[PDB]
Amino acid sequence: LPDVVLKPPPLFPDTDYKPVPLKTGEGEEYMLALKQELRETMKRMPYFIETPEERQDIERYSKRYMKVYKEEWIPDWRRLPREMMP
Amino acid sequence: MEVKDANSALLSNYEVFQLLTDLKEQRKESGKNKHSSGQQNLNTITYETLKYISKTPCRHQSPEIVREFLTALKSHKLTKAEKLQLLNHRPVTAVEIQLMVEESEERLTEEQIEALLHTVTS
Amino acid sequence: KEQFRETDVAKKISHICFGMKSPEEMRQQAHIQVVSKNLYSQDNQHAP
Amino acid sequence: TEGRSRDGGLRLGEMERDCLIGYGASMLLLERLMISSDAFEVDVCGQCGLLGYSGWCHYCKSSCHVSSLRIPYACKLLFQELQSMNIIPRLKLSKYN
Amino acid sequence: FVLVEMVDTVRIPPWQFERKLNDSIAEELNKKLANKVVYNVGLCICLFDITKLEDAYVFPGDGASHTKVHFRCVVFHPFLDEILIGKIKGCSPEGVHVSLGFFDDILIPPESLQQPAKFDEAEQVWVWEYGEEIRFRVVDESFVDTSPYTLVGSISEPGLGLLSWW
Amino acid sequence: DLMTYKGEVLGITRFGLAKMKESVLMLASFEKTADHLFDAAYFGQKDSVCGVSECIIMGIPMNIGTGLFKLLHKADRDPNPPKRPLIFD
Amino acid sequence: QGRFRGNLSGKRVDFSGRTVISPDPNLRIDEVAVPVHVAKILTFPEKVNKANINFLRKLVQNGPEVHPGANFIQQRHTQMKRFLKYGNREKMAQELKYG
Amino acid sequence: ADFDGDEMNLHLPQTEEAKAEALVLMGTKANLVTPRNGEPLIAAIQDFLT
Amino acid sequence: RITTPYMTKYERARVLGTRALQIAMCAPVMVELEGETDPLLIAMKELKARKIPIIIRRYLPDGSYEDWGVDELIIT
Amino acid sequence: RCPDCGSTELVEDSHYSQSQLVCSDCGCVVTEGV
RNA sequence: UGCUCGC
Ligand SMILES: Nc1nc2c(ncn2[C@@H]2O[C@H](COP(=O)(O)OP(=O)(O)OP(=O)(O)O)[C@@H](O)[C@H]2O)c(=O)[nH]1
Ligand SMILES: Nc1ncnc2c1ncn2[C@@H]1O[C@H](COP(=O)(O)OP(=O)(O)OP(=O)(O)O)C[C@H]1O
Ligand SMILES: [Mg+2]
Ligand SMILES: [Zn+2]
Known part of the structure; x- marks a missing residue:
């Protein structure tokens, strides 16, 4: 008969097989660097719409100095249906 | 118990002083034994806030004076926070407006300070 | 000084939403894992 | 309990409940079947809809949405048995107003 | 100091029915919101005024008078400057x-x-x-x-x- | 009229009662407890407390009888009391 | 004997009695005679107010032995019940607060 | 009932609201007629008719 | 104003119950009771004297409501 | 001990099929129901 | 759990 266990099995049981090391070369490193560059450059892209901040405490003279300015892309309303015009 | 707006409208210390005086007089005219024994923190906070306001120059104020001060400062294009701080502090010295009051650069003009002092002292 | 927290609210149940739980939700809801098939100890006190 | 030797109480059967319904006495039925028989106060979490203990929800590991609620003890037993049967009743609480 | 709009369900016991409803509501709100800090709001001082006061229900439970009251109260919360x-x-x-x-x-x-x-x-x-x-x-x-x-x-x-x- | 309000004569048996009623708790309490409960858990059907049986089970006053209406207190009050004027704004 | 039929729709309650019936024409149609023995067991919680204070005082003074009386007193401030069979019932009656 | 050994139950409400609802809705004087056909059930019986 | 002007027995029972529960909790009396130690008797006296400060809020099934005073309704 | 008077005269006296451990001096019901 | 009863 199977023996009784006093404590539950470990949350992460150990394994004798380890993951194979990743492939190396100029190609993998270049792809990694390019993915990092895309991560860094796509957040500042106008397509990356951020959450609109709200509930401003007060209005100040420094508002014009701290006003965030960013160019906005103009969608082609000819292909897009009329329901998405602002 | 949710709040609708935590920044609905800013008010100066004079309104708080008037509200505290009114609540104090209504309490001393309608003192209840069990109501007071249930929560004594009300009396403490009201009395101590009234004492703190009395320590400030917030006395000798009236709604007409506040309206006149607001109408005088409306011509100086100042923000609501600056006039609120000037009313709550009542600066008698110029250095309070020169350095302590924020947004000093390009706003003092070295000529408007005398008018600000004359208005706040009147 | 003191934070304002509500003591008791007159909560009324509106409706009962029946459903199912995933094994992960079963693990999260439960407190301990039952692995021993026996009930009481070997001692004469017979503690669980 | 059931019997007199066990110091038991009289049972309001299904037909008695039907008669009380026909009379329209909602408060009397509530006092008999809930207040005077198996009244209890449980803690329900308004986020996940599960039953908590001592004003604390172990499922969400929080206590802000936990609120007290009056309930028959048999109803809580039924809810627990259903949770044991993988039929999870999620209670969406709301103010009495 | 700033005004905050709040909506509270105040329960007045029946032994306070001879008192005026608004006065007792204000007293209860002041007793409930004195020397207490509301999260993301600040330390409330006292009640400023009562704007909206709708009908007063009586529940089949406790039997007291439950009123939903909309009010404005003063709190201490600077504007970061x-x-x-x-x-x-x-x-x-x-x-x-x-x-x-x-x-x-x-x-x-x-x-x-x-x-x-x-x-x-x-x-x-x-x-x-x-x-x-x-x-x-x-x-x-x-x-x-x-x-x-x-x-x-x-x-x-x-x-x-x-x-x-x- | 109750038997003939959905356009089809539905009996008082469990099938007609299921076709007429919608409350899961009452269907489970009457007959076929486990089947109805498992079907509701599968469908995820939310059951309200509008019915009398669920009101009795959950320990709340039923909507029928004296609980159809609500009572109000004729307390001395003044709706929309005068508001303290704001001097700074 | 399931939960729905035996514990939800129809369940057992306390503050109830069961007794054999006997005829009595000298009582009104809206009145029913209760034995003294059952009346001493089935209790009703009355709240102390400005109207029945002097009646509840005498009821407490009588005690759980005399038929017109009470068995337990629950204070307004603390919910710790007090048995009337022990202790000075007169002191309890003199200290009957409203509520 | 026929007074040949029948045992009857007697319940005491623990709420003023329940007591008032019982006295008003389930009062003996207010339920002298059955809702089936309006015929009075509480009436004279044997040894009262004779 | 469209419902029945007569006060139903369910409304009577609920109003009497609420008034008795209030009076039992040290509520003020408006009929000057004369040796009535039972709160339900005081509630019935207030109902007969038409001095109960309770307004019934009759709700229509669609959602509309209407307020009726106890003194405004008709008792039997 | 009794929570009201502090006495140690806690007697288990069942009053009409109700198990109840109650103080014997001031009558304060310590525990009730089983 | 069984069973004999009480209407
Ligand atoms: N053979 C037999 N079975 C019984 C007896 N009492 C109970 N049972 C079984 O147990 C079930 C009912 O249990 P209960 O009578 O509620 O047990 P209980 O009275 O709560 O037990 P205690 O808590 O010890 O009083 C039935 O389905 C029976 O099969 C008995 O005296 N003899
Ligand atoms: N199985 C049962 N279910 C419901 N009620 C019952 C049952 N057995 C007895 N009773 C109660 O007893 C009563 C039955 O009496 P009834 O049948 O009218 O007279 P009887 O027993 O025929 O007497 P006679 O033989 O006519 O002298 C009515 C009912 O409330
Ligand atoms: Mg018989
Ligand atoms: Zn939760």
């Missing part, structure tokens, strides 16, 4: 302990921005010379119940000059 005048109610080596006059002993100014002669040697020494002013910087709140304070704020003391007191 307000100037205050407090008194030094103590001092620690890592920072002075200034308290607004009998209002709240929660203002903890960090001593990391004054002219480079800043230190507290546990003898209540404020600052080596060349009514205490305060510039609120940020608000911060925290919870209390986590098992089966809440407002400190940071204070700035820049090179204000202070011709009256160093």
Whole structure:
């Protein structure tokens, strides 16, 4: 008969097989660097719409100095249906 | 118990002083034994806030004076926070407006300070 | 000084939403894992 | 309990409940079947809809949405048995107003 | 100081029915919101006024009078740049302990921005010379119940000059 | 009229009662407890407390009888009381 | 004997009695005769107010032995019940607060 | 009932609201007629008719 | 104003119950009771004297409501 | 001990099929129901 | 759990 266990099995049981090391070369490193560059450059892209901040405490003279300015892309309303015009 | 707006409208210390005086007089005219024994923190906070306001120059104020001060400062294009701080502090010295009051650069003009002092002292 | 927290609210149940739980939700809801098939100890006190 | 030797109480059967319904006495039925028989106060979490203990929800590991609620003890037993049967009743609480 | 709009379900017992409803509502709201800090709001002082007061129900349970009341109450919450005048109610080596006059002993100014002669040697020494002013910087709140304070704020003391007191 | 209000004569048996009623708790309490409960858990059907049986089970006053209406207190009050004027704004 | 039929729709309650019936024409149609023995067991919680204070005082003074009386007193401030069979019932009656 | 050994139950409400609802809705004087056909059930019986 | 002007027995029972529960909790009396130690008797006296400060809020099934005073309704 | 008077005269006296541990001096019901 | 009863 199977023996009784006093404590539950470990949350992460150990394994004798380890993951194979990743492939190396100029190609993998270049792809990694390019993915990092895309991560860094796509957040500042106008397509990356951020959450609109709200509930401003007060209005100040420094508002014009701290006003965030960013160019906005103009969608082609000819292909897009009329329901998405602002 | 949710709040609708935590920044609905800013008010100066004079309104708080008037509200505290009114609540104090209504309490001393309608003192209840069990109501007071249930929560004594009300009396403490009201009395101590009234004492703190009395320590400030917030006395000798009236709604007409506040309206006149607001109408005088409306011509100086100042923000609501600056006039609120000037009313709550009542600066008698110029250095309070020169350095302590924020947004000093390009706003003092070295000529408007005398008018600000004359208005706040009147 | 003191934070304002509500003591008791007159909560009324509106409706009962029946459903199912995933094994992960079963693990999260439960407190301990039952692995021993026996009930009481070997001692004469017979503690669980 | 059931019997007199066990110091038991009289049972309001299904037909008695039907008669009380026909009379329209909602408060009397509530006092008999809930207040005077198996009244209890449980803690329900308004986020996940599960039953908590001592004003604390172990499922969400929080206590802000936990609120007290009056309930028959048999109803809580039924809810627990259903949770044991993988039929999870999620209670969406709301103010009495 | 700022007004906050709140909606509360106040329960008045039947032995207060001879009293006027608005007066008892105001008293109960003041007793419930005195010397307490509402999260992400600030420390409420007292009730300012009652704007909307709808019908008063009576539940088949407790039997008291439950009223949903819309009111405006005053709270102490700076706008991250307000100037205050407090008194030094103590001092620690890592920072002075200034308290607004009998209002709240929660203002903890960090001593990391004054002219480079800043230190507290546990003898209540404020600052080596060349009514205490305060510039609120940020608000911060925290919870209390986590098992089966809440407002400190940071204070700035820049090179204000202070011709009256160093 | 109750038997002939959905356009089809539905009996008082469990099938007609299921076709007429919608409350899961009452269907489970009458007959076929486990089957109805498992079907509701599968469908995720939210059951309200509008019915009398669920009101009795959950320990709340039923909507029928004296609980159809609500009572109000004739307390001395003044709706929309005068508001304190704001001087600074 | 399931939960729905035996514990939810129809369940057992306390503050109830069961007795054999006997005829009595000298009582009104809206009145029913209760034995003294059952009346001493089935209790009703009355709240102390400005109207029945002097009646509840005498009821407490009588005690759980005399038929017109009470068995337990629950204070307004603390919910710790007090048995009337022990202790000075007169002191309890003199200290009957409203509520 | 026929007074030949029948045992009857007697319940005491623990709420003023329940007591009032019982006295008003389930009062003996207010239920002298059955809702089936309006005929009075509480009436004279044997040894009262004779 | 469209419902029945007569006060039903369910409304009577609920109003009497609420008034008795209030009076039992130290509520003020408006009929000057004369040695009535039972709160339900005081509630019935107030109902007969038409001095109960309770307004019934009759709700229509669609959602509309209407307020009726106890003194405004007709008792039997 | 009794929570009201502090006495140690806690007697288990069942009153009409109700198990109840109650103080014997002031009559304060310590525990009730089983 | 069984069973004999009480209407
Ligand atoms: N053979 C037999 N079975 C019984 C007896 N009492 C109970 N049972 C079984 O147990 C079930 C009912 O249990 P209960 O009578 O509620 O047990 P209980 O009275 O709560 O037990 P205690 O808590 O010890 O009083 C039935 O389905 C029976 O099969 C008995 O005296 N003899
Ligand atoms: N199985 C049962 N279910 C419901 N009620 C019952 C049952 N057995 C007895 N009773 C109660 O007893 C009563 C039955 O009496 P009834 O049948 O009318 O007279 P009887 O027993 O025929 O007497 P006679 O033989 O006519 O002298 C009515 C009912 O309330
Ligand atoms: Mg018989
Ligand atoms: Zn949760």
